[PDB]
């Protein structure tokens, strides 16, 4: 998409950064330009005290139709290994920046999600789809295996049988099927999707943000640990959150529940407006 | 709950130990008193030749509403690190004793199941819920991450997307949702739950008890092994069961199927009354 | 089944090897004869340029009712450890040959699938069941734990709760339940099953066969890797596929999509008839 | 050793708890009495503000000659599985309490170290031996495999070849050989051993104690992680140490090096007497 | 080496099977003929009640100079993938049969040990070298990476730095260096090697053979487990050894130590001649 | 070191890129300027057809004295979390670029190597030290745990006991000790070090460069795999090297050994001047 700075756009609304792939006429294909610009935008939004949540959406009828077969594959193969490695590092680096983002991330998938879009899909903590969205590991249909981690995304989110069929047959899952097999959290009609995402973002914004970061990372990390190692790890993490959370939110919440009896944590969030312990 | 020995109760009925969290007016919150008494009760029931199955239920409207914010957190923080570590070891030790219990374990979850109740929920081999039960990682709602292993429980039982939403949003799953996402085996109306649990216990009691112990441990252990390592491990385990099972139940069953033709193992259990090989 | 060479049969139809367990009157039980003959048949079909897909079905009312309690267990125990180890190696070796087969594999499960049939069930990449099929870890019902890897199969395919219940209770899953819990891909009436399998095989045959092999192995392998290790591994695999695929199918497909615009990989396979890059 | 409270002794000298196995005439064999008393002593010393280091030594000519063949094995086998499991839990629990101890631990091994003494040997962070000490996995010589984790100790400390020979041949390593193969840190004549241990303890006491705890745990934990997972884990740990260390020792040390230039951390410890940042 | 049955020879002496690679004039290169014959010989010796130990040596100046560049590589590449896979399976299968052998195995390495000889070298439990032996990952010197697992052998036995240098530089280790870096147990002059191996074999033959098998497997297996998983695994293994060991050697040994006081297991093996418990 | 472009220097000599940390008067401390410039230099040298090997040395009396306590820690803490994360990503990213470098890497450590220098030390494939070099995890001496992966470096290279002592005691290893415990490959007098490194580089340059890359990565990767997974992985890697190596060096070498008999791979590298197969 001619200018690099035009390949991604964003708006800040009510402390949510709404970030969009912005190559609509190229179905939001991941070119090196988009991969560099997406990192730049993610890097500048990450530690803004007024950005609580990042939503990743797409302009036009695609969410993301994968890597750019022209600009990511053909043009880089022409500059040899050096060009291939530079292009790969640009794509992998922004998926990783999104995966470990300081703020909670949400995929808003209204349309086409193919191939190398699976990395960014997985890198979002939560994911909400339109019924009319279509998800495919289309890689087998153009003679390549599902790289950019896409095979691992399918295996880490979906049942083995479902991942195997998805990668071998290159057939598409509807939003409803993507939700049934846990590729995404939920599917709904396209005309309801933005409002649901906005509601989820507004709920996260009400939580202690430090607590949400430590929790979302804990979920990602304890997948790659034994039960017994994860038990000790979660204790170590809470000691870190104790340092990070200057608001001392656990003591604030304990006072509101035990002493004030103004909320029940089983039924709703503590009031982080209040600061008395 | 004033006296330590009153924090847990049990009944033995038809070789099933029905164990209940017994702090109903405190929603069965896990205080250090309950954590010590639960270990004591589990330890004394474990190797009783008349206890075939242990069911973990709760008195009052909660199953278990998590750790006691007053007695487990506030009062122990006041005695410093020493008090915190003593309290943590008491909670972790009984969840582990339950997780590796000599006898099959069943969670009977009729009501509230929150936070640090996830360890005991996972430590039960099987789990049956009331439709009216509510399951939550409420930790984020009082500003802490889901410790006492609860994050790992969510990740080891439920699809990653579901675990992520559950831990970040602190919203509750109904019994039906808890069953759909494999937090529990089944959900049913509260008025049907005890009878279903009683039926499941009576089925396990009819199996070779040594076989059930070796099998339930095998399921837990092979999650943390490669396929190829698990293949050899399962051979090693059967050699152990051969030693442990004095009834020589595999030869008893082989005679009943091959020679007597009185049962078909695909369709029902062998008669462990009979002892001829 | 008296002669070893009669324990397995196959037909080649439209480049699909239809292989059948052929001990119908013994419910296709895995005897040492069948284990040796199944390896021999799999070994001779594997690298045939006219075999694109292998389907594993069964003659008679069983798919596979497990190991032969008479010929695999009783008769080998009578020749001691030496006989037991020889028999075990014959069973494990053919399940492994099937699991890593050069060609895509499909389980066509019309009927009984018990115990040590789980290894071959898992060793097939894809699996399609009749509603009337019945799947059981019947091992607990004859006093043994689910060996021949069967416990690991249950844990690698199904949710932990479901695997635990399945192994401890020795109750059977219907085809529909086997599909809901991802033991198989799909369930349908028995009279529709062969046609669905034939359709799936004919779709795989249309893909680049080298691409399908590399992909199906990738799915199996990345389960046993961290996300970050799997990212690099998938790059290494594509470099291998580049060598293996003399048809240079990725460049063929790129031309058809970018230059010719005759297909869209999100919506269907490239035409591997064409050879221009 | 008739009274349980006599099976272990300790002295506090210059903030070092010198703990000794105290069954000299039974070569410090681990009986259930000693296993219970060792946990009690470790538990009461752990969080003493005047205990900086714990040294584990032995009275008489043995350090520890393993499990008590009479009181740990024979007498417990006589009370059946229940007695065996109680005895095993008592031994495993104190080795684990020592392995994760709040304070740095040192093994002072002057003499015999056999079998089930390997768990406590490994559970000590550091280990110093007399030339005249003798270390053996003597288990094979009395027909058992090296349990109580001893096989794993040998594999986690020594080269595979050395561990294999040690476990299969049941021959003894001298102190010098134990040091060459990294079973211990150092070996020296018995008459020099206590002074070296005293010197090592006095060096640890001069460090920031919170820093030593976080570091020693980090070493133990990162063995069971991939490089890339360990990188993130070590960041999480430092955030915890930031909370735990009220002395804010990293800022104290930075001032002494950058501003005051009174020490060089490459060459010695910062002065934790000073409190200015 | 013209006839397949001539590629391997063996002698039985004092219950030790002395097996030799027998292609001396081809430096004992692993051809498909040798790979098939080595499996056949290993398979027939394994469960002989008069074979306690297997030693793997070589005829002529090589132990094993790796895979046969002519018969294993060139001739099989000429029959395509099918020929390559058949040849690979023959080599891998016998290395694995040796690695998990029922009996203890010893490598007697008097001379050249190169490349694909590392699999068999590692598959032997113990290894003894001549000073004049030379060990090399010569693969880099003929433009291939160290396959047949050789890279993994180097990493599992030697320090990472040593393995890296060994694989990248294709320079040779002397016997003494091979012992210093734990590729083998010991190095000695060639004229002393056979007698040392004979002495080691005669020591293993005096141990309880079932105990040696369970122990040697435990060492190999606990490398691929967390400490805490290995603790439970070793308990499971002893339950298996209890079944396998009809001699009830642990009770025999306990009587000889506790009651008879005729041996000290720290200092020597129990007398397995005696059978009283 | 005032200008960013001055913090690193390099020379190309005989196809070796000699790269030096260039803040001699600050003992080559890793400031954000150096971390950015080191990535830039590594990135531009990596795919130069005239760069076969990269050596990492240091100007002045240090190799690398760790992170810059002023510019990496103090100044970034002053810009908050955003500044800390930016600085961490710059350091981690260049250590990783070096660790997976297309070309073989060598650490030339003539002097001080402290703390956060361990990441770059480990990221070099090979390492050669001066006797007068001093290696320390000095972190404990300034009250922090050994981050920037340094703890993991110590555990992945050195015996557990040695790593534990090194991290807890903050005492320094000499070059000779660093070599004995496998932190580096070799130690020699400082006046011999450059010539030895030059000789090692000139040997690597004579090998097939594609072969060296695939091999060095294989060594790093198979540490984090089971034996059985590593066996298959190494086959996959050779298929990749077959694609990457246009020189078809394995067939060139096979001709020189089998047909021409001009070299013996056990004793030296094939002549990659020659191109006939
Ligand atoms: C660390 C962890 O494990 S987090 C613990 C789980 N976190 C939670 O969110 C549960 C905390 N408590 C809850 O929200 C309860 O389950 C509820 C509020 C949903 C139950 O609702 P209700 O039926 O309305 O009960 P209510 O809130 O009135 O509780 C009744 C009593 O139980 C006590 N109680 C309930 N949960 C807890 C708890 N986790 N710790 C301590 N006391 C508790 C209440 O303080 C109250 O005590 P009081 O009447 O003596 O003042
Ligand atoms: C170790 C493992 O893999 S466990 C093996 C699986 N375990 C099982 O529970 C299956 C064992 N057998 C079964 O239960 C069968 O599938 C059944 C009974 C459900 C099939 O039901 P039916 O259609 O009624 O068949 P029926 O039991 O009459 O079997 C027919 C024949 O097959 C034989 N057969 C069935 N399964 C097996 C088996 N696993 N091993 C050996 N023979 C078997 C029967 O002995 C009988 O032989 P016969 O007629 O020559 O005497
Ligand atoms: C390596 C990977 O990640 S694989 C990439 C994913 N693979 C895929 O199968 C997606 C490839 N493209 C698709 O199939 C598209 O999503 C479609 C065809 C389903 C979208 O359908 P349509 O709405 O009919 O769009 P259409 O195919 O006409 O595409 C519109 C434009 O986007 C371009 N485009 C679409 N996807 C890509 C892509 N992945 N790379 C580059 N350009 C692309 C098309 O070339 C076309 O460009 P043009 O009009 O300038 O010639
Ligand atoms: C987080 C980590 O990586 S920990 C960093 C490693 N930690 C350490 O212990 C090293 C810290 N520094 C050292 O101890 C040095 O290597 C020494 C002191 C051993 C070198 O000894 P000397 O040769 O006597 O050098 P000296 O201490 O005088 O240092 C010379 C200059 O380098 C600076 N310097 C040395 N190391 C560092 C460092 N790690 N960060 C910042 N500046 C440093 C000194 O401040 C001094 O600056 P100045 O002269 O402008 O005031
Ligand atoms: C399961 C495990 O952990 S295996 C335990 C370790 N196994 C071993 O091989 C050690 C067993 N015992 C030994 O061999 C001793 O260390 C020795 C024999 C080397 C010590 O040698 P000596 O100094 O000659 O001591 P000796 O054998 O005379 O033992 C002295 C006393 O300690 C007792 N004792 C020694 N080790 C043990 C033990 N592991 N369990 C129980 N009692 C023991 C002896 O029975 C004897 O008791 P008695 O005098 O009341 O009859
Ligand atoms: C894939 C892998 O496993 S790599 C295999 C290991 N790679 C190697 O570097 C070893 C290859 N061969 C060697 O270098 C030999 O060990 C040597 C050269 C060191 C032995 O040195 P010498 O004693 O001088 O023996 P020489 O090279 O003359 O070999 C004698 C015979 O053995 C043959 N031979 C030796 N090694 C091999 C081998 N790996 N494959 C096939 N034939 C071999 C030689 O071709 C020669 O055959 P010929 O006399 O019939 O023509």
UniProtKB/TrEMBL annotation, chains A, B, C, D, E, F:
CoA binds at residues 26-27, 65, 67-70, 116, 138. Acetyl-CoA binds at residues 26-27, 65, 67-69, 116, 138, 142, 261, 264, 266. Keywords: Lyase. One of its GO terms (molecular function) is lyase activity. It comes from the Bacteria. Pfam families: ECH_1. GO terms for biological process: isoprenoid catabolic process. Belongs to the enoyl-CoA hydratase/isomerase family. This is Feruloyl-CoA hydratase/lyase. It comes from Sphingomonas paucimobilis. The gene is ferB.
């Amino acid at each position: 998409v001619e200018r690099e700075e035009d390949t991604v756009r964003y708006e800040i609304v009510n402390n949510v950064a709404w970030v969009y792939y912005n190559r609509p006429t190229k179905r939001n294909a991941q070119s090196p330009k988009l991969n560099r610009q997406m990192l730049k935008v993610l890097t500048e939004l990450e530690f803004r005290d007024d950005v609580g949540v990042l939503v990743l959406g797409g302009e036009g009828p695609a969410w993301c139709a994968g890597m750019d077969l022209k600009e990511y594959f053909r043009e880089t193969e022409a500059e040899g290994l050096a060009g291939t490695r530079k292009a790969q590092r640009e794509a992998y680096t922004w998926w990783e920046r999104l995966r470990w983002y300081q703020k909670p991330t949400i995929a808003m998938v209204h349309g086409w999600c193919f191939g190398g879009a699976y990395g960014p899909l997985f890198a979002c903590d939560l994911a909400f789809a339109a019924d009319e969205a279509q998800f495919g590991l289309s890689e087998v249909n153009w003679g390549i295996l599902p790289g950019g981690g896409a095979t691992k995304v399918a295996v880490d989110l979906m049942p083995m049988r479902v991942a195997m069929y998805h990668a071998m047959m290159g057939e598409n899952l509807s939003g409803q099927d993507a939700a049934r097999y846990n590729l995404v959290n939920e599917s709904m009609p396209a005309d309801q999707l933005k409002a649901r995402v906005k509601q989820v973002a507004e709920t996260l914004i009400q939580k202690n943000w430090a607590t949400v970061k430590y929790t979302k990372d804990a979920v990602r990390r304890v997948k790659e640990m034994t039960y017994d190692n994860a038990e000790d790890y979660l204790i170590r993490l809470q000691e870190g959150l104790n340092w990070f959370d200057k608001s001392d939110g656990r003591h604030v919440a304990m006072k509101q529940f035990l002493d004030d009896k103004t909320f029940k944590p089983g039924l709703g969030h503590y009031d982080k407006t209040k600061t008395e312990v």
